């Protein structure tokens, strides 16, 4: 068990809070203390979830989901399933106040989209401006819907909390600068969490592994600021049964799930026939052998930066199966029919290339290059983007 697997947060003031990490508690909190605190649970990457969200983040097993059709007993059984995971987890962590705090504020009525009216979706701080939230809970503090923007957790597991404001000591300064001054003050092993509108405190490095500059975007936004990229390598985790392609950033995988069987196979040089690597120009994906061959210097730099062994570039089998278009959407590329209607010269769109004979080369190239070189899209690509 991790010594920082929970943090207990308490209100001590107008817009003032204090936290204590599990390992720093000087006493064994009673069930009342547990139930009166905002309880933050550490997930597998060091994000911290308040209770109603930690509970729903328990996922249902594939088999159980399938076996379940019903409905509403559907909700009942999902809840009973998560309730036992939740209860057993609280027992092991030694927590005796196990309230979930999912109860909604029943004085608040939704708009026709079943969402909060704009007048009901803000909390007002005394000194720091307003903050937008996702949901109105009957127990707002305990549900996590009242925390500050920033949680710092030092190498000693001490918690410091912070609010941004328009024109503060970091106005128009970058998250990375705040970050450097934090690790100078506290130690370079210090963790920084940035609050989501939901109440989740996402670790700053988790956010950057999701999209470079996300941590900074979230940081700026707290102060009312606004400021202005394919993954380096990707692995196909789809094509199953055969199922659709789904290419997941290698960096994401290796940073965030260092003991995944995908991650560990990749580290040993396996699954190289499912790996795509970005050209020096940023516009094209190709196999690792193709890149090794066509640009050995960039190959060696990309593979060291991303954490893959250079042996992948001396491998080859004896490409028509691959999707005609892939689309970047976070740290993964998706086939067009996998994106929701709201998701869909986009610089996020990559086309399965074809040579002068009409045959698939295996590469994917950005649509912007098709426009710049005045190259017509292949017809398979062209109809998916219609």
């Amino acid at each position: 068990r991790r010594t920082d697997e929970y943090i207990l947060v308490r209100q001590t003031g107008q817009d003032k809070f204090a936290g204590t990490t599990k390992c720093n508690l000087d006493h064994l909190p009673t069930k009342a203390e547990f139930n009166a605190s905002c309880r933050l649970y550490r997930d597998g990457v060091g994000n911290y979830y308040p209770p109603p969200l930690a509970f729903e983040r328990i996922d249902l097993p594939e088999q159980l989901a399938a076996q379940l059709l019903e409905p509403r007993e559907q909700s009942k059984q999902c809840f009973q399933y998560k309730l036992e995971v939740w209860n057993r987890a609280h027992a092991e962590m030694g927590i005796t106040g196990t309230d979930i705090f999912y109860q909604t504020d029943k004085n608040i009525k939704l708009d026709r989209n079943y969402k909060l009216r704009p007048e009901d979706r803000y909390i007002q701080t005394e000194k720091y401006g307003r903050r937008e939230i996702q949901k109105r809970y009957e127990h707002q503090f305990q549900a996590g819907s009242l925390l500050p923007d920033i949680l710092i957790k030092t190498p000693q597991n001490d918690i410091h909390f912070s609010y941004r404001f328009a024109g503060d000591a970091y106005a128009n300064k970058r998250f990375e600068e705040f970050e450097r001054a934090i690790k100078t003050k506290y130690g370079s092993d210090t963790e920084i969490k940035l609050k989501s509108k939901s109440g989740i405190m996402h670790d700053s490095k988790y956010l950057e592994s999701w999209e470079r500059g996300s941590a900074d975007i979230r940081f700026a936004e707290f102060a009312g600021e606004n400021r202005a990229q394919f993954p380096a390598a990707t692995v196909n985790m789809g094509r199953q049964p055969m199922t659709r392609d789904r290419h997941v950033s290698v960096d994401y995988l290796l940073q965030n799930l260092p003991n995944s069987p995908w991650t560990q196979a990749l580290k040993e040089g396996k699954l190289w026939d499912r790996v795509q690597v970005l050209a020096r120009d940023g516009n094209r994906y190709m196999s690792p052998s193709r890149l090794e061959y066509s640009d050995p210097e960039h190959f060696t730099q990309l593979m060291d930066q991303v954490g893959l062994p250079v042996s992948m570039g001396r491998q080859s089998h004896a490409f028509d199966r691959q999707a005609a278009v892939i689309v970047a959407d976070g740290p993964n590329l998706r086939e067009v029919p996998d994106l929701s209607p709201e998701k869909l010269s986009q610089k996020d769109v990559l086309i399965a290339d074809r040579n002068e004979k009409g045959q698939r080369t295996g590469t994917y190239t950005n649509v912007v290059e098709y426009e710049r070189l005045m190259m017509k899209l292949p017809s398979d690509a062209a109809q998916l983007l219609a």
Binding site: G44, L53, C78, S196, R246, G330, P331
Partner: peptide, 28 residues
Amino acid sequence: HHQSNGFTSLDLEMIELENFVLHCPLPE
């Protein structure tokens, strides 16, 4: 939608990928 409506659209995409990637079987 009370199981998911306390989450941001982005928090749900994050979770979806984490779950996908935690439960994905190696190829044969």
